[PDB]
Amino acid sequence: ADPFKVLQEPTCVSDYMSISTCEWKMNGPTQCSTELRLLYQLVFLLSEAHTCIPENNGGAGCVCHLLMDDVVSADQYTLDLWAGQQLLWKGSFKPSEHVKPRAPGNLTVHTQVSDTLLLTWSNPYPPDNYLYNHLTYAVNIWSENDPADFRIYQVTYLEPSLRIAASTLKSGISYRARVRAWAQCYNTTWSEWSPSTKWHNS
Amino acid sequence: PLPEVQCFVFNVEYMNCTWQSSSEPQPTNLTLHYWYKNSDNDKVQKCSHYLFSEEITSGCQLQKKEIHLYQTFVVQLQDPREPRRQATQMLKLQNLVIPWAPENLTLHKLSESQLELNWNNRFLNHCLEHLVQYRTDWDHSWTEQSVDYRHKFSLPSVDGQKRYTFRVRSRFNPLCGSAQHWSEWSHPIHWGSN
Amino acid sequence: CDITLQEIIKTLNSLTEQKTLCTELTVTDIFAASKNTTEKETFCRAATVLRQFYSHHEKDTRCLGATAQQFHRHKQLIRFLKRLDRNLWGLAGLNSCPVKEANQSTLENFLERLKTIMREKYSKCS
Ligand SMILES: *[C@@H]1O[C@H](CO[C@@H]2O[C@@H](C)[C@@H](O)[C@@H](O)[C@@H]2O)[C@@H](O[C@@H]2O[C@H](CO)[C@@H](O)[C@H](O)[C@H]2NC(C)=O)[C@H](O)[C@H]1NC(C)=O
Ligand SMILES: *[C@@H]1O[C@H](CO)[C@@H](O[C@@H]2O[C@H](CO)[C@@H](O)[C@H](O)[C@H]2NC(C)=O)[C@H](O)[C@H]1NC(C)=O
Ligand SMILES: *[C@@H]1O[C@H](CO)[C@@H](O)[C@H](O)[C@H]1NC(C)=O
Ligand SMILES: *[C@@H]1O[C@H](CO)[C@@H](O)[C@H](O)[C@H]1NC(C)=O
Ligand SMILES: *[C@@H]1O[C@H](CO)[C@@H](O)[C@H](O)[C@H]1NC(C)=O
Structure with a gap:
């Protein structure tokens, strides 16, 4: 039903400049770069969505670097981890609270x-x-x-x-x-x- | 033409506005009138406390109740002997503040070689910026490091065979206002011996 | 006051430092008509005014000068305006705040006025 599973809540941090890196663990051996897609989007009117392709971090671990134009304290992001048509996980992330x-x-x-x-x-x-x-x-x-x-x-x-x-x-x-x-x-x-x-x- | 007024708010307690009297062709008492632009309470005011130098009007002095930072301030330097000879001027008081020198400096050990300096200020904790200064009795010049509004410096490397001396001053900048001038150095403080 | 209000101020100090080619263009002065609105309405309103500005002038020929330097200055101006917008908006927390007025103003004075409003706001909390 749900072959690919995220074991624990994904965690992210920001360098508060251009990058935010989320790390998470899968339930088994996974080709992150081939099976997953993380879509992030700033929570602000008339803002588009972006797609990040996860790198692998150990056999069943993945990491993905979300690139950002700029960052300010108010900014918050929606995150959606997909494995095909199956939403694995949904969350929010505020760069300024995890620098x-x-x-x-x-x-x-x-x-x-x-x-x-x-x-x-x-x-x-x-x-x-x-x-x-x-x-x-x-x-x-x-x-x-x-x-x-x-x-x-x-x-x-x-x-x-x-x-x-x-x-x-x-x-x-x-x-x-x-x-x-x-x-x-x-x-x-x-x-x-x-x-x-x-x-x-x- | 008449001298230019130079106001300076002290620790946001009271303000001093002065001018050099030795620039006039004759002795006189220039009057000072002030008012705030495009805000509540536009009505002009008279200097309620004149300052005198060489039996002449040295300047004006307003109290806290009269000081309004963040509100265009306008001074008027009038000459009674000439109702048409005067100059009007507008200031941004917020940029003319000058805090009192920090006081009650302490010096304790937080660790084996972590020597932390502390001090307190006068009602403007989060509006101040600080410059800490130290040296040994052998140094020919001080070395300075800047905290932002931290009031907590710390030397990471201390030498026991040396007498240290510390001092700091504060500045009302850059979050609450852009004041150029620092405060007077705080009384020194010493540590260890030799 | 936490970091949000602080970022807003730094950006303002930054913007009022040097004026660019398009700091003369006008915008709705929302301060000269303070109708005893809430603190929030102001922040939100200011966000709206600025948003309209960078929105309309981002790719403006006049603004992007003839020299690379004018070009970068403008790009940066726009960047900072966006930073102001998003923080100010976050501070207000209003879905909408109509800026119905007609009193125009030069962006230069607008920022200078806004900077004072923000610095005062900061000087309050502790
Ligand atoms: C600063 O962060 C600490 C730690 O929180 C976590 O660790 C970070 C480094 C990050 O990796 C995240 O996982 C977390 O945000 C906060 O710790 C709390 O501190 C308060 C006292 O201020 C205390 O009551 C709680 O017990 C602490 N929470 C935990 C889970 O230990 C701390 O609150 C933050 N400090 C400030 C000023 O907000
Ligand atoms: C190491 O130092 C050099 C300075 O020579 C840095 O290179 C400069 O970086 C700044 C800011 O990123 C640029 O504006 C300059 O144009 C760069 N060169 C010049 C003129 O110095 C370099 O970024 C530093 N590296 C680290 C790790 O911070
Ligand atoms: C203000 O003027 C008085 C009287 O001249 C003077 O004694 C005082 O030091 C002045 N304020 C300052 C410079 O702190
Ligand atoms: C000015 O004021 C002082 C103090 O009130 C007074 O002694 C003097 O007579 C006045 N006239 C002038 C112009 O000196
Ligand atoms: C230390 O300095 C403070 C000023 O903030 C003063 O009020 C206090 O009385 C001083 N300490 C004592 C008790 O001497």
Whole structure:
């Protein structure tokens, strides 16, 4: 009757820029890309519907990236998961209530002064984006040979910079760093870690 | 022609509107009249409390009851010795606010090296923007980081063998108004020793 | 006041920063005729006015200048107007709000006036 079944409520998050990713689990081995179609449509007069083709996420898992022109807090979406002519599931999704920020990038290390070590990175969002001024960060620094001794610095200001007193960095070895971000105003989760960056300091 | 008025709302408690008296060909008492444009209560008002400098009208001063942000404000600088020599002017008070310097700064440890600075403001929590500043007794210049209206900074890396000093100031911008000027730095505060 | 009202303000600050080629065009001034309507009716009404604007001028030749820069500015203007519309509409929660009036206004003053109404609204809640 209903060969294809969604096991649990699908979950989505938005980067609050162009993408929203829904994840869900099927009842058995499934070719997501061949059997399913997710139709999303903004709940706003004179707005068209869109079709997303699910990627596979493990044998019986699917993922689908809903592309959006823009996003604002008021916006809400209808979602309809189809398997042919059979509606598998129907739901709503408000991007602004499930934000997961894009990972920060361009993590670079500065070693001009001897007292303090300077770390800088880039904020992934354009300045015109509603999340730009709401991100704070967390830098992760660890030793390559001694991963055991790793620290996590919390950057609670707007500037994408960090200063750590070299009086805490065993010279001679090489450390690696990476940073992620979140926005408290939107009660977001953490972003993914940015590519790492190793440096040998003296 | 006469001087230009320069109003400045202080912490939205009282406003000060002044002008330089040493620009007139003779001593005089310029009168100040104000009124709000295209809103309720258009009727012109007289400056109910003049300010004096060198025995001359330094400026005007209005109280809270008289201050209306978000309502085109119009000042008039009249000269009694000339009923036709005057200048009318309209302001957006919301952009001329200047909060009091933050006070009651605290400094406690949230963790082994998480040193959190706190402070409170004067009735404008969500309209303020802050600039925190710190250094060690060896630094030749301060380093500043900006919170938005957070009033909660935090140094992620603290050095025990160093004396730290912190200070902040607030600004009424950019959600409630676009005020260019900051407030005066808060009294300093110290931590640890050496 | 949560984030919705905040987004509306930022966009406004953004729009009032620099004026474009079509910020001179006119729209129904719904503020100069405040008939003691509800706070909602206003938001909704403002949404309607702006909607009509981007609706009618999106692809306007005049607006899209002669230089790529004029072109992008216009595209962005339109983008932000849409952001305003959808948030303001969400804030009101009315299915309809007729904007029966005749007092015209320059979009530039409209946004500038609206920005003041929004900033004041924000300064209230805490
Ligand atoms: C911020 O979110 C938390 C967590 O909610 C969930 O986790 C998110 C990261 C996301 O992945 C979603 O699954 C959920 O929205 C909220 O947690 C609640 O916090 C309140 C206190 O504010 C507490 O009473 C509840 O017990 C928490 N709920 C649960 C299920 O643990 C939190 O409410 C959000 N904070 C704000 C400011 O709204
Ligand atoms: C890493 O840094 C570079 C900056 O050189 C970023 O590239 C710029 O991105 C901005 C905003 O996306 C564009 O407006 C610029 O035109 C790009 N180049 C210039 C002129 O710098 C890049 O986006 C950053 N990457 C990450 C991970 O944020
Ligand atoms: C307002 O004027 C009075 C009297 O000149 C002055 O003492 C006060 O400091 C002024 N307000 C300011 C600058 O805070
Ligand atoms: C101006 O006012 C002051 C204070 O009332 C007074 O001393 C003075 O005589 C007045 N006349 C002028 C023009 O100085
Ligand atoms: C701390 O500052 C506040 C201002 O918000 C003041 O009212 C309070 O009395 C101060 N603390 C004390 C009790 O000294």
